[model samples]
Target: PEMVRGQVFDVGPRYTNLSYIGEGAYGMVCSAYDNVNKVRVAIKKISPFEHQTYCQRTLREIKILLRFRHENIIGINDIIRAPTIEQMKDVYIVQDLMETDLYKLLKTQHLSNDHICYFLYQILRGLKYIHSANVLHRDLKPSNLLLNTTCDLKICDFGLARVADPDHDHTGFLTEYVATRWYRAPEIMLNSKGYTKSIDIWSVGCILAEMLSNRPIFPGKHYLDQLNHILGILGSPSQEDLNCIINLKARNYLLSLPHKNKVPWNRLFPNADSKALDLLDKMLTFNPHKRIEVEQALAHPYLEQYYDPSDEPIAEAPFKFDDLPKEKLKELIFEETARFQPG
Candidate 1:
């Protein structure tokens, strides 16, 4: 069933006088109460005057949320509408409010290989779930990924998602046009008209490497620079690849890519385990055809080893989300709220 606002019950008083969370191109996020459970939730509050584009994207996000439900992905608690004019109402989507984004964590702490593996496993789980539903998250980056005090990753912001149905006659350039270009797959960066979920797989590869090193795998200043970085480490696209793929042998910017540019996996992550490095190479392959699927990534042997790849305690561990103090929760809220105040 399509999740219209009327279907969900309004949990009262818990989220009254919604507090600001963050700002975005389409709207601003605010924290509110579910009223029934008195639990904290987030609502992306966008005005009607902003843009019609946001409305469509917001609805698409709602559909994706309603269709896919997982612990590693953000949840939609409820949807409500508030009256602004005589007959007009603004939409309110209530969701789990996270503590911070991966961006902040990447800045503050030096993440060990163990931490990267856990995050990568959960992200793969999310993508696996999304792919099972025939949806493609066109945009996947560190900033769009959110975390709570426990540091569990939740993939959020489906603003740039594309339905993977070839029958629909979409140009395939809905919102990927405006997304973060740094984490873009080679096919996308090169502007290939015909691409698949492999685009996201490529992004996952970049993210996995970025997490291991605490820096971007491809820090290209412009589109030309971005393509250069990919080819520089992965080697130049083969002549046959140029003829078959739409953007594989882009002439205008292909010159920027150097020949004989293959970096060893160990060079990037000197301290990473060989098992993890081995998997990373397969995902970050120079040929998009060589990219592994989400299921393959989930079944990796590294995940089956002694370490708990999902961060959920496979063994008896003391850490629990319930153990968090109320004051600590307040600090996270206060810190995010500070982003909107006067400097």
Candidate 2:
């Protein structure tokens, strides 16, 4: 392992670059070897200090990675930073390394029923853990799913993840907009004010459809366009469904659209078995409340053989920032970084 310059920066002294993985909106990611641990790892180096918004997002991601522990979730090995203030220009997050992501895998080859079921099962398993912790992985696209040749899939990326009470309003700290457009739930696209973990279940449905068909189930051009895609397949939301929408604009927009009947599931996935489609129908429901919960999806006829009660996630207290100012966030990050310092 040696120094790699330019687009990818130097990852301090302890970790040396093996090769570049790829770049993301946050920063460049590269595969590296940990000199002290004597193992391969993935390092994400980003200048979160550049913007307050970015810094908070980065801090939130770090918090989730540090707090959540599950086989189906990516593990954070360590956090590397400078010992001094001036030298701490960038933060390097060392994570478990995987051979490839689901996006690349799907592009290369078609997945079989076993692959789809296992992959989707692992995702639900991860969600069971995260949602039990009252965390929502707003982003759940295929690209976010890391996989190995053995078909072991681990859910990664928590930049948009947030904590909320499943039973009550606890999302005052959250923004109206969250989640990617394609995998977004109807409740989100329709601007529901306070949502629950069901939104994640909706995304799981979209991901499942993509795996079966090898294309995005709802490939909307824009947020508004997303509804059209949803309506094209799921049909117009019933008047009762429209009544559940709290946002006036979202409700009115959906009402304005001409009524459309849902396309048959057989037409959607001509080759997929009935059991798999049964689970998909439950997840892609228009009403968030009607969507299947994680545990329920795991127990569906399609996935029942793989189900184990021992796999259920225990509920956890949600993570909170308590409106800490930007300056405090900086101090907190520095303090957190020092906690992982080599001794």
Summing lDDT over every window of 10 consecutive residues in candidate 1, give the lowest-scoring window: 313-322
Residue 129, candidate 1: Cα error in Å is 0.8
Q: State model 2's lDDT.
A: 0.81
lDDT of 2 by residue, 1-343 (tens): 2445555466668877568777766677888888888888888877877667777888888888888878899988888777876667778888878889988887877989988988988999889888878788888899999987677889999988878656663232113565788988766655554348888888899999999988999999976677788889999888898887766766787777888998999897999979999999999999887889998998898987689968666546656653667667777788767778877
Q: What value does the lDDT take at residue 325 in candidate 1? A: 48
Off by over 4 Å in 2: 1-8, 165-178, 193-195, 246-248, 315-318
lDDT of 1 at 298: 75
Per-candidate Cα lDDT values, in order, are: 0.65, 0.81
lDDT of 1 by residue, 90-109 (tens): 45566787888887888777
| Residue ranges of candidate 1 with Cα displaced over 4 Å | 1-14, 48-50, 83-86, 166-176, 239-243, 246-258, 306-343
- lDDT (Cα, 0-100) at 15 in candidate 2: 79
In terms of lDDT, the poorest run of 10 residues in model 2 is 167-176
* Per-candidate alpha-carbon RMSD to the true structure: 11.8, 2.8
